[PDB]
Amino acid sequence: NSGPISILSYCGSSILMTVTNKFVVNLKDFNMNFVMLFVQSLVCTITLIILRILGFRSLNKTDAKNWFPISFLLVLMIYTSSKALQYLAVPIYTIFKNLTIILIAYGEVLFFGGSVTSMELSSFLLMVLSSVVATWGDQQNPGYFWMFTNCITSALFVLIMRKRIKLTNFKDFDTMFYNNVLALPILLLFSFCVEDWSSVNLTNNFSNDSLTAMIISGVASVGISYCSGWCVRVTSSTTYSMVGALNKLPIALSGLIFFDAPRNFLSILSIFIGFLSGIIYAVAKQKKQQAQ
Amino acid sequence: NSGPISILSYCGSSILMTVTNKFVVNLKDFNMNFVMLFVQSLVCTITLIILRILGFRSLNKTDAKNWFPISFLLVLMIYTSSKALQYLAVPIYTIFKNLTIILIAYGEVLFFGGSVTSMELSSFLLMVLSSVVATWGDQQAVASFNPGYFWMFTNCITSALFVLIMRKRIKLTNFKDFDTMFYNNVLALPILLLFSFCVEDWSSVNLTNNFSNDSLTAMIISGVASVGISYCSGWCVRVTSSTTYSMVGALNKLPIALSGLIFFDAPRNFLSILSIFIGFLSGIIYAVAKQKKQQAQ
Ligand SMILES: Nc1nc2c(ncn2[C@@H]2O[C@H](COP(=O)(O)OP(=O)(O)O[C@H]3O[C@H](CO)[C@@H](O)[C@H](O)[C@@H]3O)[C@@H](O)[C@H]2O)c(=O)[nH]1
Ligand SMILES: CCCCCCCC/C=C\CCCCCCCC(=O)OC[C@H](O)CO
Ligand SMILES: CCCCCCCC/C=C\CCCCCCCC(=O)OC[C@H](O)CO
């Protein structure tokens, strides 16, 4: 586990999680989003514990209270992100979620000090265009405030995890385990603070059937769980933040091939612009090694 | 005459020419652009000879047939723009004309061999955003769409083939300013009358009534201001870089657009403003890029 294998790994799970959540679990637009994530991180936790007794990990209290900010950034990342999409459109959220990419690249400079290649700067802007270009080819204040929060919480999150990982020599699995376990409590705070619970009404909603999807989702979410922390650790907090935005293209590109859906050339340019953005960013990484 | 002083000259001239064509001569959208522009190239021609005898330039036959493409490239650059602008909105025309900056920067690779700094690449992409961002912040048979984009594809290359070749033949023929100004004005004058019959419709019973003593007087007014840009356009490309002239020219319209928000109580859009300040960022990156290029060697 090192090198570009991280990125190919992150794809299959984000590819698996996108398909599986839309093919395996049809209409996963549940009443309580955090509960699905609570299981996705809980089914992930159980899966690891089964693996410890068949051979991976460790348990501390010194590292423990230093990771809680990361998890708290995660759930807040979702709460802010979840709240952004309530008042915001999907394409524009990508634009700001793509604008977050830049600061994350320059946020790594404040945690590790590296320089942002002028070529890397070009790639991110192309995603911005590919983001805007796609946005300009579609239709549909409260939102922007939460997106201003998602941009920062998603940044401080992916940044800090990468910090504490290399600080506590957290090998993979270790990253996965702590993020799954420590998020479990915080989700119950936001699950109780945000969702509506009613034993008269919702106790019937997520019945014996629905949980099958939430656990099915968790098993598929196992991939993304392990690979996210593996990507940030080996490569860069920028690399993980970039691949996440790039993934939706082959998924979006798959949506145009595998589907007879009304399209627009503007939408296509965005996807191919995003594809270009990777090539520049892919080559940009090359110029860092060769130059130095 | 050298260095960034060129840019202010090309800027001030493009700015003075913008006002003079829009405030002093309102409805500068004439029925026959080539004749209006033919005068602008004639007053420059007339203007130059008076200075030729008051002190700058030269006339050849070896230079002549190597310069004819520029005037033809120059006038053709306009005809494509005029015909492109018929089917396209002002902001969208801006986007592609800013995309030519990329090829022009990379067209220089085919003409002189310099490298396009990744930092330079950043600016050009940003210019796209300030252009793209503004377009998304605006209002306005398929076979009617495409005719514009088609005419724009030619303007983009002729706009490239134009400023590119001139800068080469300029540095090849040591064309000092005026020479750049003179030759493009002189050799273009005939082509302008060429396009005058090729495009315009003439009717002395009807069109003779259009260009009256007011409008006819105006056609000279615009040329008087265009003396700057004419001398400064070729001055800009020569001293700095064929990219710089293609960049500063695109940069100029920001402060004029910024004037529209300040000097005017006009409905605005934050997107429009973001675009403009995005453009300023575009310059600063390009300014540093030029700064990092000269510093390196
Ligand atoms: N470290 C860690 N990360 C996790 C875990 N579980 C989920 N994540 C991460 O939480 C994020 C949210 O999950 P996804 O729904 O898979 O998001 P996505 O595929 O990355 O897509 C995002 O960008 C798209 C545009 O490119 C958007 O369309 C999408 O809505 C979302 O914002 C992802 O980055 C995922 O890797 C876990 O246990 N641990
Ligand atoms: C509602 C909209 C809200 C506002 C939307 C804003 C969009 C901002 C876009 C791009 C910013 C790019 C910033 C680039 C800063 C670079 C500074 C720097 O340090 O550059 C060094 C680099 O190496 C030089 O190549
Ligand atoms: C509304 C439309 C918006 C769409 C906008 C689309 C822009 C695409 C145009 C040009 C790509 C220019 C990038 C060319 C690739 C540069 C490669 C490079 O610099 O390579 C150096 C390499 O490392 C060897 O040294």
Swiss-Prot record, chain A:
Entry keywords, A to Z: Cytoplasmic vesicle, Endoplasmic reticulum, Glycoprotein, Golgi apparatus, Membrane, Sugar transport, Transmembrane, Transmembrane helix, Transport
Outcome following mutation: residue 248 to A/D: Decreases transport activity and GDP-mannose-binding
Gene Ontology cellular component list: cytoplasmic vesicle membrane; endoplasmic reticulum membrane; Golgi apparatus; Golgi membrane; mitochondrion
Cytoplasmic face of the membrane: 55-71, 120-123, 161-174, 233-238, 285-292
Miscellaneous remark of the record: Present with 31900 molecules/cell in log phase SD medium.
InterPro entries hit by this protein: SCL35B1-4/HUT1, TPT_transporter
Family assignment from sequence similarity: Belongs to the TPT transporter family. SLC35D subfamily.
Compartments it resides in: Golgi apparatus membrane; Cytoplasmic vesicle membrane; Endoplasmic reticulum membrane
Residues bearing carbohydrate: 98, 201, 205, 208
Transmembrane regions: 1-19, 34-54, 72-92, 99-119, 124-140, 141-160, 175-195, 212-232, 239-259, 264-284
Name of this chain's protein: GDP-mannose transporter 1
Annotated segments matching region RET2-binding: 285-292
Effect of residue 246 to A: Decreases transport activity and GDP-mannose-binding
Function: Involved in the import of GDP-mannose from the cytoplasm into the Golgi lumen. Defective copy causes severe glycosylation defect and abnormal retention of soluble endoplasmic reticulum proteins. Involved in vanadate sensitivity.
GO terms (BP aspect): GDP-mannose transmembrane transport
Keyword Transmembrane: yes
Membrane topology, from the record: Multi-pass membrane protein
Entry keyword Transferase: no
Residues involved in GDP-alpha-D-mannose binding: 238-250
Encoding gene per record: VRG4
Effect upon mutating residue 245 to V: In VIG4-1; increases drug sensitivity and decreases protein glycolysis
GO molecular function terms attached to this record: antiporter activity; GDP-mannose transmembrane transporter activity
Lumenal side: 20-33, 93-98, 196-211, 260-263
Pfam families: UAA (PF08449)
